[PDB]
Design a binder for these strands. Sequence first.
RNA 1: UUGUAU
Lengths: 210, 200
Amino acid sequence: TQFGNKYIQQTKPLTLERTINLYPLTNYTFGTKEPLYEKDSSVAARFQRMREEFDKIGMRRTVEGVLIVHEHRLPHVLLLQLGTTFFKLPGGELNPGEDEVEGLKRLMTEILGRQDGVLQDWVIDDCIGNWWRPNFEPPQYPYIPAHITKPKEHKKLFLVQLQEKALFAVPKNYKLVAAPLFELYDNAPGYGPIISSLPQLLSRFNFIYN
Amino acid sequence: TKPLTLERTINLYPLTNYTFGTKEPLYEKDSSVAARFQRMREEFDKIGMRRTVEGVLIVHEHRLPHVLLLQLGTTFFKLPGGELNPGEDEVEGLKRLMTEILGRQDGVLQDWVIDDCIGNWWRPNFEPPQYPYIPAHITKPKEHKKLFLVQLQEKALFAVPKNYKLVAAPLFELYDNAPGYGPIISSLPQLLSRFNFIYN
RNA sequence: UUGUAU
């Protein structure tokens, strides 16, 4: 309208400047819930299950959420530690035909969703990267390698935007840590290729401290 | 349908769609590493933090993304880009730089399509180290580098200064190869993984 | 520490 106030919006397109709110770690409350044990009792049991499942429902589709907070204006990724030395992002396997984002909201709620009844919604608007697994082996890559026509798994990473305050419940078998970016950066020996390239995957975001 | 924040579709075209001529050499303002950091200090005191922008132009070959790199010698590769002028707009500046380095000289309008930021790197000191985040307690970074995805038109003519060679590097060549390309180019594969690339 | 460019 030319007969009224102009409500000024961010000028650059969201493709060019994507602004994201980070709140302090101390804004969040953490509790404990029942342990979530893995579907696989060992490595062998797991690439075996991965082969079997591949034959009768196709390529495995995984989604994972990157949750970010800050401490004195420095971004930290929330990582689940499966006992000493092993870290994973929240997320997991999509059901057949399941929407990626609906699937990740499902999985975020299972792993970290509060128990006390206060409903906790997840804001998931951004894809931050993609990883493919060309064989039934541990190795993954941020592209589909040459001559790979039937990748065995496809993993999609998403930025999960947190509310100003929230309560999370951590399954008993896990510890939650907040890893600063300098800790992840150039540290594949500590976190693997996927987690340790998060700093890079996060660098395009214009973070707001609060 | 899907927010361009959730899904970003980009059209790639074959390398052969593009033809590469040459023009007169375009020499860097600094002739050595030593002079580069010397000039970084002057301009720092004078006009403040260096604002640098660079362009990632992608093509495909048999359905695999290749990034175009300017090879200055047998061991050094750079992305099209450069230093912004004080106050100058980032995308406007980047367009200016891409035309200097790669713009055809046959009078034809070359319009660069720059819609997407793909990363940021900061240089805390007047030394080589760059990080994809402002490191802890660095209040005054000396350089801020910003990377953009440039969507190429369907066919184009580019003119490469006789002192550079343009190359198309497949992602598997860049990935896990900081030793060959540095920390910035060698992580373009990760930075590019989010895009849904259409082959044509 | 991808760096001098015949």
